[PDB]
């Protein structure tokens, strides 16, 4: 998590760098253990007929978080991506933290962040609702509408094109705030029942199945590695469906 040894970090959009730093700082002092991705993946690069895709991966776990995945990527020289998901252990019923940032030479094109529900009523837990509301309604000039598969995201989901540095900073701070709420709730939550655990597991399964419908991610992977590789990557590395 010291991103000191990342080859991509120095080269990424500044908002991405600040978000990577913030995620790493959130995780750094937790009771981390490694999480081995398929084929013990770390760095990977590929090219077919166009630009090369370069990816760096970090992945951990804790008793409360099944899988804590930070991925940085770059397509060619211009397109930078940050992907992060904290997948909860269903036993504790925590929501899913996620963020996705896409940037090119013109700046950040997409900034998405959420604490996504796993309950069958599609609501966040009561404590999360309360803490999130207390942050106030952020102002962003260039909101983007989620695609249909994005029904999985909460009412607090951010999906914007930042308009200026002030908005970039506001977005990062809201992610810092989401992480602070999430980490705190993770120590105050225990534990639910076998029926509740099963409910939460289903919510996480559904989240991953829906995330796999993102053709924007899929096309980037396919253009560098092909259809079969992209399908394996999306279903096994990014959005693994638990059992
Ligand atoms: C918590 C949410 C969340 C998580 C965790 C997550 O992984 N994605 C999430 C959301 C989300 N992503 C989106 C977009 C894009 N994502 C990529 C690429 C990659 N994203 C990666 O994570 C990897 C690994 C990529 C490639 C290697 C590109 C290129 C775009 C288009 C950017 C643009 O339009 O300006 C959209 C909008 C979808 C739409 O408009 O139809 C949503 C909603």
Swiss-Prot record:
Highest taxon listed in the record's lineage: Bacteria
InterPro entries documented for this protein: Ferredoxin-dep_bilin_Rdtase (IPR009249), Ferredoxin_bilin_OxRdtase (IPR022870)
GO molecular function: cobalt ion binding; phycocyanobilin:ferredoxin oxidoreductase activity
EC number(s) given by UniProt: 1.3.7.5
GO terms, biological process: phytochromobilin biosynthetic process
Catalytic activity reported: (2R,3Z)-phycocyanobilin + 4 oxidized [2Fe-2S]-[ferredoxin] = biliverdin IXalpha + 4 reduced [2Fe-2S]-[ferredoxin] + 4 H(+)
Keywords recorded for this protein, A-Z: Oxidoreductase
Pfam families on file: Fe_bilin_red
Record-linked HAMAP family: Ferredoxin_bilin_red
Function, in words: Catalyzes the four-electron reduction of biliverdin IX-alpha (2-electron reduction at both the A and D rings); the reaction proceeds via an isolatable 2-electron intermediate, 181,182-dihydrobiliverdin.
Family: Belongs to the HY2 family.
Name this polypeptide is given: Phycocyanobilin:ferredoxin oxidoreductase
Source organism per UniProt: Synechocystis sp. (strain ATCC 27184 / PCC 6803 / Kazusa)
Lineage of producing organism: Bacteria, Bacillati, Cyanobacteriota, Cyanophyceae, Synechococcales
């Amino acid at each position: 998590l010291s991103l000191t040894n990342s080859s991509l970090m120095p080269t990424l959009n500044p908002m991405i760098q600040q978000l990577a730093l913030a995620i790493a700082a959130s995780w750094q002092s937790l009771p981390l253990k490694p999480y081995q991705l398929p084929e013990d993946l770390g760095y990977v690069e590929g090219r077919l007929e166009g630009e090369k895709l370069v990816i760096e991966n970090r992945c951990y776990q804790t008793p409360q978080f099944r899988k804590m995945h930070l991925e940085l990527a770059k397509v060619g020289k211009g397109l930078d991506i940050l992907h992060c998901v904290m997948f909860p252990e269903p036993l504790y019923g925590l929501p899913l933290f996620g963020c996705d940032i896409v940037a090119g030479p013109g700046g950040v094109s997409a900034a998405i962040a959420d604490l996504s529900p796993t309950q069958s009523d599609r609501q966040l837990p009561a404590a999360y609702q309360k803490s999130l509301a207390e942050l106030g309604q952020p102002e962003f000039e260039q909101q983007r509408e989620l695609p249909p598969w994005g029904e999985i995201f909460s009412e607090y989901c951010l999906f914007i094109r930042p308009s200026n540095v002030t908005e970039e900073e506001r977005f990062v701070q809201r992610v810092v705030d989401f992480l602070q709420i999430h980490c705190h709730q993770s120590i105050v939550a225990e534990p639910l029942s076998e029926a509740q655990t099963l409910e939460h597991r289903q919510g996480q399964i559904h989240y991953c199945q829906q995330q796999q419908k993102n053709d924007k991610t899929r096309r980037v992977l396919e253009k560098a590695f092909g259809e079969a590789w992209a399908e394996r990557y999306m279903s096994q590395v990014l959005f693994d469906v638990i059992q």
